[PDB]
Design an enzyme around this catalytic site. Structure first.
Site, PDB file in Angstrom:
ATOM      1  CG  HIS A 143      48.795  28.067  31.356  1.00  0.00           C
ATOM      2  ND1 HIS A 143      49.740  27.354  32.074  1.00  0.00           N
ATOM      3  CD2 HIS A 143      48.587  27.366  30.211  1.00  0.00           C
ATOM      4  CE1 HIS A 143      50.097  26.278  31.388  1.00  0.00           C
ATOM      5  NE2 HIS A 143      49.412  26.265  30.251  1.00  0.00           N
TER       6      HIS A 143
ATOM      7  CG  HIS B  69      49.515  30.706  26.534  1.00  0.00           C
ATOM      8  ND1 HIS B  69      48.148  30.660  26.387  1.00  0.00           N
ATOM      9  CD2 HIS B  69      50.034  30.050  25.463  1.00  0.00           C
ATOM     10  CE1 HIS B  69      47.848  29.996  25.281  1.00  0.00           C
ATOM     11  NE2 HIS B  69      48.976  29.614  24.701  1.00  0.00           N
TER      12      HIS B  69
END
Ligand code: ZN
Ligand code: ZN
Ligand code: ZN
Ligand code: ZN
Ligand code: ZN
Ligand code: ZN
Ligand code: ZN
Ligand code: ZN
Ligand code: ZN
Ligand code: ZN
Lengths: 361, 361, 361, 361, 361
Positions: free
Chosen positions: B250, B253
Site C-alpha cells: 500500500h 500504491h
C-alpha cells in the site's frame, strides 16, 4: 441464507495495561462509575480509580452486592445517573461483568470490561443467561472496550485459568458441529468464514500452549505462552462461540441447573469440560480422537467423570432430568443434533464410561 | 507490548439483504439520511428508500456531489441536522462511503455502510486517506452496520470484483511481514492471533474460489464461490489489513500519487496488485512462489507490468519519485522493512522484469 | 433414527451368462413369460427363449409395445395369467424393465431382469418414475434375479456405456450430500455404513477404469476394465442411489421434463451429467475439484454446457421453469439442501459458465 | 545492509595432530614462545616443545600464572620480545587462550591455538570478554592456526565435552533469532547465508551424535561420532556465533556475573544451557519443542533448573539483578528482542518451572 | 585422517560498499598500491582512488598490462616497494586478481580483493593455475579482505553472472563426489562438515534464486535474489571448492587447454558447465536428475553440447587429447574416480548426446 458476524468495538491485551486506562478514555469523557465487589476492589479496583484520578477523571466507586439481579442493576444505575457519569467500568468476574453490561444499556453509556481472570469467554459477548437456566438474553451492544491485563491474570488462581481453557476448548467442537449441519449461531445467521477460522485457530492454540500457560500461572509469571492462551480464552473463544455457534456442550452445562447439590460449586468451565466430552460421545469419533481431549483435561486437573463433577453413583432418573432440560425447546443442542432426551442421558453415561476406561489405563 | 483488535459492530451478508434494511434498523430509530451519487440512486438508492418507507422510517434523500471534501461533508451534515435524522446510510463506492463516515462522526449518528461492489476493503474500517497522498486519518469508530448484498454485487462489472480480489490478495502478504518483523498495525499495537488467522484464511479463500467467483460475476449469478470471495474481499481483508498490518504494497500504491497521468484512471485494486508484486521482489521468495501470484493476476486480467499500469518506458527519475514518496517518513513500509528509496526504485523495475520473464514463457 | 438397506435378492454378472438362464431357474419353475421389444427380440430375446426350451421351460413370447403404460401392463399380465406362467423375464432397456417389474407385482411372480446395456442404474431398484415428472413409486420388491451379460454389453453402442458411467458418477456426489446433512434415502431411513462404502467405491472405480472401459466397448471386446465398470454402473450405482440417497443431480434431471424440445432425445445419463455439475456448483468445491469431473465427461463425449444439452441461449424464464420443478415439494434436492428456485436457476447458469471457462483453456 | 563473514585462517583437526606441529610451522619460522599453565604443561605442553625441538624450532617455555590480566600479558610479551620469537603458541583452556591472543597482538606474531578440551567455542574467535561482565573486546585478527587433537580431547573429563555441547547448542537458537529479526552479528553486519548454513548444521550434528560422542569420551576412545561433535563444538559453533549472531542466551550467561556465590564454579557451558532454556521461554515454541532440548540436556547431565545452577529458592530481587544486567545497554539480547528486565526475570522463573514440570513426568 | 578448513580473513558484501574502502583500511595503513587494467580504471578504479584520498590514504595507481606473468609481477612489485606501500588492492577480473595476490606475497602485504563481476569463485581462494594447464600453485595465504559491491555487479554483463552461476553449480557436484570417495580437498585433508554444509547450501541457493538473479542483472537492479546469488558465486562456491574438493568437472575444463581454437574465447564458467555435465554422465544418475541441470543451463543461455563449446563434429582423436590431459597424473579427477582416458572420452560424447536428446524434446 445470511451470514452474520458481530464483535466488541476494541480489544486490548498486555502486561500492566490497566495502567493506561486514563489514556484509552481520553476523547470519551471525564466522569465514570466503577463497579466491583469487595475482594476485587483490593485486587484492581483501587488501582483503577487512582489511575483515573491522575487523569482528572471522576470516578464513582460502587461495591457490587454479589447478586446480578434487576434490583442491583436499578440501584447502581441511579448512582451513575446522579453522578451523571457517561462511562461504566465493570471489573471482576462473571456476575459483576454482566451487571455492568445491564447498567450500561440503561444509561446508553460507553462500557469498559476489565476481567480479573481468563476463566470464561463471556467478556466480549453481547449476551447473558436468564435463570434453573431459562433462556439467553441479548444486550443492545457488544462491549465498547475489553481491557485484559496479563499481569493480573498471572496472579489469579491456576484453577481459574484451567477453567477458562476448558470453556475455550468447547468452541471449535461446538462451532464445527453448527457449520456442518447448516444451523444458526447466536448472532443470528449461518457462520462466516471469519468465525470458522477463529474457532479452529482457538483449538490449535490451546493444544500448543495450554500446559505451558498453566505452568506460567502456577509460578505467577507472564510469558508468550500465557499471552497466547489468554487471547484464546477471551477474544478467540468469545467471537467463536457467539458468531460461530453453540451446540450440545453448553446445553449440557445448562441442564445441570436442573439438579441441586455440590455440583453447583464448580466453575462454568469445569462443567463445560464434561459437557464437551458428552458432545464428542454423541458424534462419530474414534477412541484416539476422544482420548486426545481426555488427556489434556487430566493434565489441567479438570473433571472428566460423573464422580469428578459431584454426581457419583447418580441415578438414571437424576441424569434424565439434566437430559430433559438440555433438550428443552429452544436449547442450542437442536442447532446441530436431532436427538431425544433419552439419547442424551445415554451419552452422559457413555462419556463417564469412556473416561474411566482411559484412566484404567 | 500490547495487542489490539478493532472491528465494525455488525456485519451482514447475503443475497437480497438490502430488502431487510428496515428490519435491522428496528430498535434504532425512524429518521435517516441516505447518501448516494446519481448513478447509485438508480442502482440501489431508490430501493433502499422504498424499503424504509414501508417501515414508516423517514428518509432524507441526499445526492453526493462526487467529491469527498470538507465542504460536501459540512453541506450534508446540515441537511441531516435539519431533518434531525439519527441514522446515516451511505451507499455506493469509496468516496461516498468515506463521506458518509465523516458525516456520521459530526452528528454522532449510527452508521450503516452498504457497498455496491466488493472492490476494496475500506468498508469495515475506521480509516481514510488524506491527500498526492499525505496521511491516514482515523474516524471515531468503525461502522455500526455493514450490509453486503451479493445480488447487487453479482451485477456490478467483473473488473470491480477482480479489483477487490487484488486489494484482498495484499492482506496476508503485508500482515505476514508485520508479524515477522514485530511492527505495529493501524489499530495501534502488535497483531493479535485472531488477525493472523483471518489474514491467512483470506489468502487461502482467494486462491480456492477467486476464479470461480470471477466467472460467476461474468454470468451475473450468485454462487457459494461468490459468497466466499465477497466475504474475503470485505470482512477478512478489512479486519486483516486494519488489525493485521500494512507494509510495502500500500505504500507503493500511495507513492503513485506522486505522478500525474493516465495511471490515475486505474482502480485502487489494480494499483495494489502491482504494489504486491513489488513487496514480493523485496522479500526472499523463489521464482515459483512469485509466479504463483503472477499467474492468478493474469487469470483475472489484472496488471503485472509497468506497461499495464500506464507507465511504459518510465524513466529512472519518474520511478524514483514514486519510491521517495513510498518511503516517506510515516509510511507503512517502515513497519516491516529497512529500505531506502533507491532499494525500492530497484524493486519496482525487478517486479516488472520478473513479470515480463513469466509472460515470455 | 433407523438405518435401512434394501437389495435385489441375487446379482449375477459375466461373459455369456445369458446361456445359463435355464440353470438359474431350476428349482423355481418351468413356465415363463418373456417381455422385449422388436429390436431386442433379435439381439437377445430369441437366444433366451431357445435356452429355456432346451431346458424344457415353457416361454410365452411377448412383444413390448414400447410405452410403459397401465394398459400395456394389464395387456401383458393377462397373457401371463392365461399361460399360468410363474416367472417373468424382462429384457432390454428402461421402459421394458419397468413394465416387467409392474407385471411381476400383479402376478406376484418371480422376476428376472436382463439389461442389454449398462446405461442407467434402474435395473436393481425397487422403484420407477410416474410422469412432466410427477413422483417416484415403489414396487413391492427389488428384483429376484438381475442377470448381466458383459458380452451383450460390449456390443451395445459406446454412447450407452458413457451414459451409464454418467448416471453412476452422480451416486457418490448425491449420497455424500445426504450423509453429511443427515437426510433420508429412498429406502426410508438414514444411510447405512454399507451404502456409504459402496457409493464411495463406485466413484473410485469409474475414475480408475472408466476410459479403458469406454475404449473396450468401441472395439467390442470384454476386458477386466469393462467388467469392473459394468458392475459399478449396475450393482454399485444401483444400491448406492437407492440405499445411499438422491439429492440435487436427479432433481435437476426431473426438472428438465418441464420443458419441451430436442433435449428430450438425450439419454437419462447425459442429462444426469449436467445435473451433477449443477450440484457441484451449489456446493463448496475449489476450481480443481470441479474440473476433475468436467475433464472426465469430455473424455467420454458427455455434455457439459447448456448448448450441449440442446438449450443454447436459453432464457432466464426457461431456466426458472426447470428450477421450479426441481425444487418442487417432495423432490430429492430437499434431502440435502436448503435452496430456492432462484438459487438453483443461478447454479444452472454457473455450471454452464464454469464448463465454458474450462473449454476456453 | 552489508553482510560480513570472518574466520580463522586455518583449522586442522584429527587424532594425534599435535605430533605434526613442527610440520605446519615450516615456512613460518624457527623461534616460538609456548604458553600453558602447570597442569597443561604435563598434559600436552612438554609433548609440543619436544616436537618443536625435533624440528630445530626454538621454544621459550612460559608458565601461565592463571589469571588473564594486562600485567600477565605484559610479562609474557617481554619474554617473547627478548627471545625474539615470531610465533606464539597457546595451549589449554579459556583464560590461557585469550591471554595468548592478547600476547600475539602486541608482537604482531603468528598465533597457533591448541585447545585441550572441546568445552567452549572461543577458540576460533577474534574476541574476548572484559569484566561482573562489562563488554566484548575484539583482537586485531582471528587466529592463524587452530589445531585440534581428538586424542587429547577423548582423554579430557566427560563433563567438559558436555559443557562444549551445551555452548554449541546455543548457536542455532541465537543465530536464528538474529536472522529473523534482521539484527547484526558480532562480525559487524547482517548474517551471510554461509553462517546460517553452518549454525543450522551445528544443531543437526549435535542432536545426531551428541550422546554417542559423550559415551566415547567416557571410555576414552576416538570415534567418528566424537570427531563430528568436536568439529561442531569448535569450528561450527565458533563461526556460527561470531558470524551468525548472539542474542539472549549469552546475555543471560553474562547477567549471572551480577551475583556472587557457588554458581561461579560452573563451566561457561553449563551456564549457557540454562540461558538457552530462557531464550526458548521468551520465544513462541510448543511444549514438545522445548522438551526436545530439556531431554537432551538431562541425557548429558547438564543443568536445567535454578536449583541445578546453585540458585535454589532464589529471590525475585536476586533474579532481577541478573535480568537488569542481561538487558543492559549494549548487551546482545537487543539484537533480537524488545524486552524489559521484568520480562526477562519472568522468563527465568518460567524456564525453571517448565523444566520441573518435565522432570515431574 | 585430518580434516582441514581454510578461509579468507574477512568477506564483506553489499550495495555500494566500495564507498567504505577507506573505512575498512583504518587501523591498517595509509599507503597503498592499486592494480587494475585500462577498462576497470574507468569502471571502479578511479572511484576507489578518490575514496582513499578522501581518507588521507596514499594510492599508487598501477595499470595492469593484461598478462599475469612473472615479469608483470616483478614490475608491479618494485613500484609498490618504491612507494613503500603496505596494502595491495586488486580490482577487476581473474588475471588481475591473481597478479595482485602474487604481488602481495612478494611484499608480505595486506591484500584487498575487489571483483567487478561475480563470474568465478577464484576471489576468496589461496590458489591459481600454472599453464596448456600444468598445475595448481598455492599462495602463502587466502586474501585478507574480499570486498564485493553488488551495485557494480548489477551493471556487469548478464553473461558474466551466468558464467559465475555455472562455475558455482559445479561446487556441490564435485565436493559430494570427494566426500563419498574419501578423497582429499585442495586444502590438504578430508572435507570438514562445515565445507559440506556450505557446498550443499550453494546448490540449493542457485536453484532457488539463479533465474531471478539473472533477470535482475538484465535490468541492472540490485535485489535480494541477486544478493543471495552473488554470495553463492563468491563466498559459498569459493570455500566449497577449495575446502570441499575438486573432481572431474574442473579436470575437464583443464583438459580443454590441450586444444587450440575458438573454444578459448569462452569464459571459465561456460567451460565448467559442460564439464559438470560430463561428471554427471560418469556417475549413476537417472535421466530426470541429469535433465534438472540441463534445463537450468539452457534457461541461463549456457552451453550444453559440443557444438555450443565450438567443437562441432570434433573427432575422436581430438576428444582423446582433452581426455588424456584431464586424466593426467595429479589432476583432480583421481580424487573421486578410477577412470581411464578412454572412459572420459566416452563420457564427453555421452553428455553431448544426452543434451541433444533433451533439446530434441
Ligand atoms: Zn461457556
Ligand atoms: Zn454446598
Ligand atoms: Zn487497499
Ligand atoms: Zn485521463
Ligand atoms: Zn439416474
Ligand atoms: Zn425431436
Ligand atoms: Zn559461549
Ligand atoms: Zn566456592
Ligand atoms: Zn571454477
Ligand atoms: Zn579466435
Amino acid at each position: 441464507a445470511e451470514r452474520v458476524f458481530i464483535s466488541p468495538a476494541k480489544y486490548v491485551q498486555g502486561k500492566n495495561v490497566i495502567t493506561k486506562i486514563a489514556n484509552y478514555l481520553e476523547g470519551i469523557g471525564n466522569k465514570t462509575v466503577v463497579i466491583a465487589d469487595e475482594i476485587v476492589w483490593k485486587i484492581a479496583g483501587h488501582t483503577i480509580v487512582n489511575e483515573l484520578k491522575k487523569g482528572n477523571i471522576a470516578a464513582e466507586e460502587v461495591v457490587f452486592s454479589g447478586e446480578a439481579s434487576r434490583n442491583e442493576v436499578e440501584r447502581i444505575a441511579n448512582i451513575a445517573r446522579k453522578a451523571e457519569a457517561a462511562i461504566v467500568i465493570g471489573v471482576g468476574g462473571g456476575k459483576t461483568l454482566d451487571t455492568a453490561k445491564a447498567v450500561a444499556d440503561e444509561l446508553d453509556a460507553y462500557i469498559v470490561i476489565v476481567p480479573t481472570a481468563a476463566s470464561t469467554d463471556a467478556p466480549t459477548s453481547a449476551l447473558s443467561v436468564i435463570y434453573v437456566f431459562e433462556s439467553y438474553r441479548f444486550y443492545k451492544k457488544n462491549p465498547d472496550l475489553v481491557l485484559v491485563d496479563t499481569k493480573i491474570i498471572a496472579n489469579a488462581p491456576p484453577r481459574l485459568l484451567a477453567s477458562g481453557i476448558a470453556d475455550a476448548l468447547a468452541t471449535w467442537v461446538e462451532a464445527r458441529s453448527v457449520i456442518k449441519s447448516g444451523g444458526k449461531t447466536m448472532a443470528g445467521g449461518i457462520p462466516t468464514i471469519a468465525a470458522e477460522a477463529i474457532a479452529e485457530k482457538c483449538e490449535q492454540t490451546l493444544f500448543k500452549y495450554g500446559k505451558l500457560a498453566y505452568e506460567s500461572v502456577k509460578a505467577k509469571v507472564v510469558t508468550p505462552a500465557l499471552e497466547a492462551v489468554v487471547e484464546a480464552n477471551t477474544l478467540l473463544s468469545g467471537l467463536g462461540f457467539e458468531s460461530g455457534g453453540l451446540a450440545a456442550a453448553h446445553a449440557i452445562h445448562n441442564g445441570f441447573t436442573a439438579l441441586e447439590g455440590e455440583i453447583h460449586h464448580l466453575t462454568h468451565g469445569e462443567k463445560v469440560a464434561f459437557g464437551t466430552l458428552v458432545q464428542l460421545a454423541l458424534e462419530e469419533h474414534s477412541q484416539q480422537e476422544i482420548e486426545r481431549y481426555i488427556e489434556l483435561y487430566l493434565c489441567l486437573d479438570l473433571p472428566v467423570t460423573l464422580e469428578d463433577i459431584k454426581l457419583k453413583d447418580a441415578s438414571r432418573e437424576d441424569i434424565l432430568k439434566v437430559a430433559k432440560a438440555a433438550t428443552a425447546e429452544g436449547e442450542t443442542i437442536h442447532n446441530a443434533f436431532n436427538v431425544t432426551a433419552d439419547d442424551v442421558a445415554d451419552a452422559i453415561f457413555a462419556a463417564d464410561q469412556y473416561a474411566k476406561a482411559y484412566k484404567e489405563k
